[PDB]
């Protein structure tokens, strides 16, 4: 049962840089290695087959190579839409095995997060809870903190953007019915690198 060992696990390059992905078969195989690109949300997509040949209509900045049991995927010049996870499959000995993946992230220049804030909706308030949504939109890098008060909000981050390589964050502040209507002014406090001063967006419940 042939075992593909891919390195590195994840790398951050800059756009137009050259990225090198390794993959080392546990035992010897021929040219029988395929290279797949999986993007967040999508199913894996073939790029390079027979260890070096380009699938029809794949940007030729993509190369694959071979020295031994060791295999080498070559994005000559990284592009912001190449943000992906890349897999080698071996098709030498059944059962077919894939790599473990390499996550290829894009390093770009700092952006600051456009902030927006959302009161709870009339419609939702009848359920007995209220959810306040702070939204940080299209910032880089990924580090940034959101402040409302704590114990309440969960939060989550869009994956890397395939066009401007930016993130986005949905911090949601879910307190209770009339625990919402007790107090009056709601605001999320955002703090992020490309923002010189910790920015705060707010609304008064009324």
């Amino acid at each position: 049962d042939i075992q593909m060992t891919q390195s590195p696990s994840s790398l951050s390059a800059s756009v137009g840089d050259r990225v090198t992905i390794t993959c080392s078969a546990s035992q010897g195989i021929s040219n029988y290695l395929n290279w797949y690109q999986q993007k967040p949300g999508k199913a894996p997509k073939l790029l390079i087959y027979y260890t070096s040949s380009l699938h029809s209509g794949v940007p030729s900045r993509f190369s694959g190579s071979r020295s031994g049991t060791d295999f080498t995927l070559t994005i000559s010049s990284l592009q912001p839409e190449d943000f992906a996870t890349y897999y080698c499959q071996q098709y030498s000995k059944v059962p077919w095995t894939f790599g473990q993946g390499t996550k290829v992230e894009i390093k770009r220049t700092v952006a600051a997060p456009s902030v927006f804030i959302f009161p709870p909706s009339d419609s939702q308030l009848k359920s007995g809870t209220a959810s306040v949504v702070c939204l940080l939109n299209n910032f880089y890098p990924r580090e940034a903190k959101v402040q409302w008060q704590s114990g309440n909000s969960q939060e989550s981050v869009t994956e890397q953007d395939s066009k401007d390589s930016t993130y986005s964050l949905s911090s949601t502040l879910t307190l209770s019915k009339a625990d919402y209507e007790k107090h009056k002014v709601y605001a999320c406090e955002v703090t992020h690198q490309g923002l010189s001063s910790p920015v705060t967006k707010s609304f008064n419940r009324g």
Binding site: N34, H55, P95, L135, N137
Partner: protein
């Protein structure tokens, strides 16, 4: 133009038996070999086996020989995966995958086209559809808020697909309750608020429910 469209993936009780289905079109089904590749969440891909629609003969994987069963229906251009005695670790996204190129070229053997995947999720909890509330609006930024549903995934689109640019569908979170929750926002011209209708379609296939909420200000 080749499209593989999957379906079937929802919640399965631990022990129960689901059946997924690839639905191929845009070529001749009996010329190519469908397969099934599986991917647990955050994880690597795993080969499940394949089947030849033209002979019906199945290429198997001896760790799935027992529970799983691949098959196909020439008439409906459809290849299936049957899954019995399901356990927590069988949760994954299940892809089908065609294997080109035409023939057996002894140098070329790869999964060229794939289905979009479907999320089988095996756990004791019960299904609940989501409730969608709006996040109402230079640049205006509206969204809609999907809340209290089980299991993953919900599939959000905007203006039924016409609106793709500027969208941001955040990944779900699990709540101490045990129901999921996510948000999805777009940004749009303010000047367009008065004259374009913005609607979000939260399709929840593990319960056969799609909720379209209209976001006004």
């Amino acid at each position: 133009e080749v499209q593989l469209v999957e379906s079937g993936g929802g919640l399965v009780q631990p022990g129960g038996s689901l059946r997924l289905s690839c639905a191929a079109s845009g070529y001749t089904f009996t010329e190519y070999t469908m397969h099934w590749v599986r991917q647990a969440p955050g994880k690597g891909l795993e080969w499940m086996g394949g089947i030849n629609p033209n002979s019906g003969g199945t290429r198997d994987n001896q760790r799935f020989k027992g529970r799983f069963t691949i098959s196909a229906d020439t008439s409906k251009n459809t290849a299936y995966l049957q899954m019995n005695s399901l356990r927590a670790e069988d949760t994954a996204v299940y892809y089908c995958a065609r294997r080109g190129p035409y023939g057996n070229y002894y140098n070329s053997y790869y999964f060229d086209y794939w289905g979009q995947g479907t999320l089988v999720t095996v756990s004791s909890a019960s299904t609940k559809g989501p409730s969608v509330f709006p996040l109402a609006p230079g640049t205006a930024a509206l969204g809609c808020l999907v809340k209290d549903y089980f299991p993953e995934p919900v599939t959000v689109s905007w203006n039924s697909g016409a609106l793709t640019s500027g969208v941001h569908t955040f990944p779900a979170v699990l709540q101490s309750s045990g129901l999921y929750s996510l948000s999805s926002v777009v940004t749009v011209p303010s000047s367009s608020l008065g004259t374009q209708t913005y609607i979000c379609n939260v399709n929840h296939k593990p319960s056969n429910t799609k909720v379209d909420k209209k976001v006004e200000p």
